[PDB]
A paper describes a structure:
Brown algae utilize phlorotannin as their chemical defense against the predator Aplysia kurodai, which uses β-glucosidase (akuBGL) to digest the laminarin in algae into glucose. Moreover, A. kurodai employs Eisenia hydrolysis-enhancing protein (EHEP) as an offense to protect akuBGL activity from phlorotannin inhibition by precipitating phlorotannin. To underpin the molecular mechanism of this digestive–defensive–offensive system, we determined the structures of the apo and tannic acid (TNA, a phlorotannin analog) bound forms of EHEP, as well as the apo akuBGL. Combining docking analysis, we propose the mechanisms by which phlorotannin inhibits akuBGL by occupying the substrate-binding pocket, and EHEP protects akuBGL against this inhibition by binding with phlorotannin to free the akuBGL pocket.
Considering the lack of known homologous proteins of EHEP, we determined the structure of EHEP using the native-SAD method at a resolution of 1.15 Å, with an Rwork and Rfree of 0.18 and 0.19, respectively. The residues A21–V227 in purified EHEP (1–20 aa were cleaved during maturation) were built, whereas two C-terminal residues were disordered. The structure of EHEP consists of three PADs: PAD1 (N24–C79), PAD2 (I92–C146), and PAD3 (F164–C221), which are linked by two long loops, LL1 (Q80–N91) and LL2 (R147– G163), and arranged in a triangular shape. These three PADs share a similar structure, with a root-mean-squared difference (RMSD) of 1.065 Å over 46 Cα atoms and only ~20.3% sequence identity. The three PADs share a canonical CBM14 fold consisting of two β-sheets containing three N-terminal and two C-terminal antiparallel β-strands. Additionally, two small α-helices were appended to the N- and C-terminus in PAD1 and PAD3 but not in PAD2. The CNo1X15CNo2X5CNo3X9CNo4X12CNo5X5–9CNo6 motif (superscripts and subscripts indicate the cysteine number and number of residues between adjacent cysteines, respectively) in each PAD of EHEP formed three disulfide bonds between the following pairs: CNo1–CNo3, CNo2–CNo6, and CNo4–CNo5. Such rich disulfide bonds may play a folding role in the structural formation of EHEP, with >70% of the backbone in a loop conformation. The three PADs of EHEP are arranged in a triangular shape, forming a large cavity on the surface at the triangle center to provide a ligand-binding site.
Residue numbers in the entry: 21 to 227
Amino acid sequence: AVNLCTQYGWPNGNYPDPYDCRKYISCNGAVATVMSCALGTVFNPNTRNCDAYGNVPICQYALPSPIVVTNICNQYGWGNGNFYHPYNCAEYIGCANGLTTVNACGAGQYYDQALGRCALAGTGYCRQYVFTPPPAPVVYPDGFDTYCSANNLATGIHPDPYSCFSYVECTFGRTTHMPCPAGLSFDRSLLVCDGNRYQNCGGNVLV
């Protein structure tokens, strides 16, 4: 347990505990220590920190097995496809028109979110937990409503330069912005919310 940080080739920081979402793995000095969130809070996979219960509905903290992602596709509105499991590198999630399937990789395999499939241990893996969260809350400057017009942006979808969890929409010069579904982040190349926080939120820089 104490060696998970180096096992996966992880930077120091906070990572999910796959058994108890009231706890988390603190990688500090390349050593893993399981830590407890203060009562009233649970580990938010998207902030990499403890957070109020209501911000993490997939953590049913009073339950035996408090991690409950078996309705996550409906809970957060995830589109069709495969996604990382927010608490467990060795599992993944399939969404089919709102229906969730919780899947497991084969023995000794780990889910690779970039490839969308499982593989045996490598040298630097479980990368889907390696990312820089945006601020919470994301503070927008007064006047951000000018963004589309000031940048002469075409009608449609654009990155949100304040948060990798969000995107901008431009409509006849009018600006709106919208967070991706919780756990998803904005792919600036394909202009869609997806499961690749590592690629969209600076994890490649951290490693």
